[PDB]
Structure formats: C-alpha cells, structure tokens
Amino acid sequence: EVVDTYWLNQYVLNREAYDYNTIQMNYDTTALLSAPAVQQDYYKLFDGSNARDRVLGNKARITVRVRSIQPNGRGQATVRFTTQQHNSNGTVEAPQHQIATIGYTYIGAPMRSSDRLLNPLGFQVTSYRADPEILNN
Amino acid sequence: EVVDTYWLNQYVLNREAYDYNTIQMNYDTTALLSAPAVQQDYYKLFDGSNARDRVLGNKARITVRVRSIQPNGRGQATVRFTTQQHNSNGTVEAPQHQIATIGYTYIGAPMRSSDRLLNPLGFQVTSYRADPEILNN
Amino acid sequence: EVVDTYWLNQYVLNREAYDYNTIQMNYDTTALLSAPAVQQDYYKLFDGSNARDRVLGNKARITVRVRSIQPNGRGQATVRFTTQQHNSNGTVEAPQHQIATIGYTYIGAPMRSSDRLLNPLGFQVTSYRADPEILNN
C-alpha cells in the first residue's frame, strides 16, 4: 500500500495538472507510467482545437493535489483528489473535487537512463478514469 | 543504483530549484528527505535579508535539471547537474553547471500519511555540498 | 584549457577539502589523480597524531572552492582558490585564500572499472604545492 499509493498519487497529480513551464516533464512522466492504450488517451488531451496546450496554453494553469488513496484489490485503487484553475490575471476558479479509478501493474525496471531515473519500479497504468465528486454532504 | 539515483536526483532538483508557486512542496519534500542537520542547513537558505524567499521571491525563479548520477561507495554518490535563472521580465540568465556530493542513508518507511506519500523508502541525506563545475574543456 | 582546468579544479577541491562522511571518495579520487610521489605526500596528511582524520575527525569539516585556473606552459597550471572550516557547534572560521601550483600529465585511460568511472582521461599530478595568498589589496 505505501509504494502503490505513491505511484498512484504521482500519476494522478502529474496527469491531471498543467503548467506550460513544467508540463514537458509531467507529460513524459505520465507516459512513462502508462500502458500504450493509456498513453494514447493522455496524448489526445493535448490534440485538436480544444487541446490543453491551446485552452490553458500559457494563460491558465491547473493545480492538483491528492487527499487520499486506498487500494481495493488486485491491481486497482481509488484516488480522491482536488483540482483548481489559476491564471495570468491573478484570479483563481473555485476548486473542484474528483475521484480517479486506476487499474495498474508494474513492468519491472526500464532499460534506459531517461526512464529509470523517473520510474525505476516500472509502475504502469493499464486503465484510467476520473469522474467529478458529488459533495452530497 | 537505480533507486538511489532517483532519490539523489529528486533531492537535488527540489533542493536547488525554486518557484514561488511550487516551493512549499519542494521545501517540505527536501526536509522529508534530509537528516535534521541537513534540514537546518536547507531551512537557513530561506532566512534573513538574503533569503531565497526575498531574493527570488515572486520576481525570479530557478530551474534545475540533473544530467547524471553515479554512486561511489557506502552511502555516497556524485550528482552532476545544471541550473538557470528565469524572471518576470521574460529574460533568462546563462546556465551554470554544478556538482553535488551527497552522503545518505535510508530510515525506512515513515509513519504519517503526509510523509509516506512523498518518501515511502525513507531516503535521507546526512551530508550535502554542491560546488560550481569548472568547464575546463 | 577547458579540460585541464576541470581536472585541476576537481583535484584541488577534493585534495584540500574534508568531510568525514565523503572523504573516502575524495581520498581515493585524489590518489587516482596523483603520481605515486604525490599520492604518498597526500596519504601522509592523514597520518600521525596531527592527522586530518584526528584533527578534523567528525568534529570539524573543510569546504573548498576554486575561483580561477589558468594554465601556464607544458604540464603546469596555477589554481586560485579559497578554503574555510565549519564545525559541530555550528560555527565557521574566517575563510582563507590559497594558491596551488600543479605539475601534471595524463597517463591515458586506466584499466579497472573502479578507476575509469572516476578518471577516464588519466589525469595525474606529478608535483603539487599550495601556499597562502597574501591579500595585499
């Protein structure tokens, strides 16, 4: 649980977050921690006219933080986290709450210096979804 | 070597780097990966009139990247990395080259959710120094 | 000049510096970058009742940084550097200024993994001295 929750946290934070200035590392890291199917789903978020690269670009940024992760089975865990948007005019949008479900495995140590210094454990997401949390409190 | 080089990289990058917007996490992470002696040396960099918080503040930022890490013994490794300063006027200072020497151990898994989700392995720096690299090429 | 100044810097810094925690690497590195005559002069600094290992031990440490290196001939260069002593009570002694004169050559690549990963070029000091700088400014 300790090791898996770390990877699940780092995966969600980097995947969901955005900053023009650091995204290249978060982008490559997310891919490094994703199965090709998952990598493609992720890559597509930066494509077309509605691309994160065009919508947020260098005008707005996304901050992500994980509150709690609890494994529930055989390659599966639930991640409870929040997200918020900041921008160039100094304003901040109200924070949203989201929950990710992550299917995962490990593929063992990678054999490239550019990969082992980022994901030595071989963490890999095989399935991913994240829905809005409804705060029925 | 794979696991230790990761921790040594993340330690140096977060320790040496600075961004008003993300430093609270890098600051706490550095402390989490540092022996109290080391933590104090680090904390002091944010103190007084020459504090990183006042010198860089929200006017300038530091970008750090590690090129190569090679362990050399019994709790000791050499980290070769670069650093550069960016600012609010859109300018960039010439990059500098530096080499860190890190003495380290591991203290095992921590027993707080706020620590295990950042340093589950227990990485801890017990000694740290970083000098300018002289590019006698 | 670029390559030689690097080796001259790394040699002086590691030779003159001291930290109980990292000295084994600096010690072996210095020897790796020294002619047997030079290695012996160096080894002797850790011998007897006035040994660096007993004087500094784990109570005090030496920090060394090189300001400038300028080659002057046929296997010879001048290294301008500073040094300071720190200790366990949290105090720091006033920094001193020193100048080293280094006679040197290269012996080509070494044939042991423990040597090539530290001195692949074969840098070797054949003569060494360092005197106090008199700041007649």
Author numbering:
A (entry chain F), B (entry chain E), C (entry chain D): 95 to 231
Question: What sentences appear in the manuscript?
Answer:
In Gram-negative bacteria, conjugation is mediated by a large transport apparatus—the conjugative type IV secretion system (T4SS)—produced by the donor cell and embedded in both its outer and inner membranes. Three ATPases, VirB4 (also known as TrwK), VirB11 (also known as TrwD) and VirD4, power the system.
Six VirB8peri homotrimeric units come together using the β1–β4 sheet on both sides.
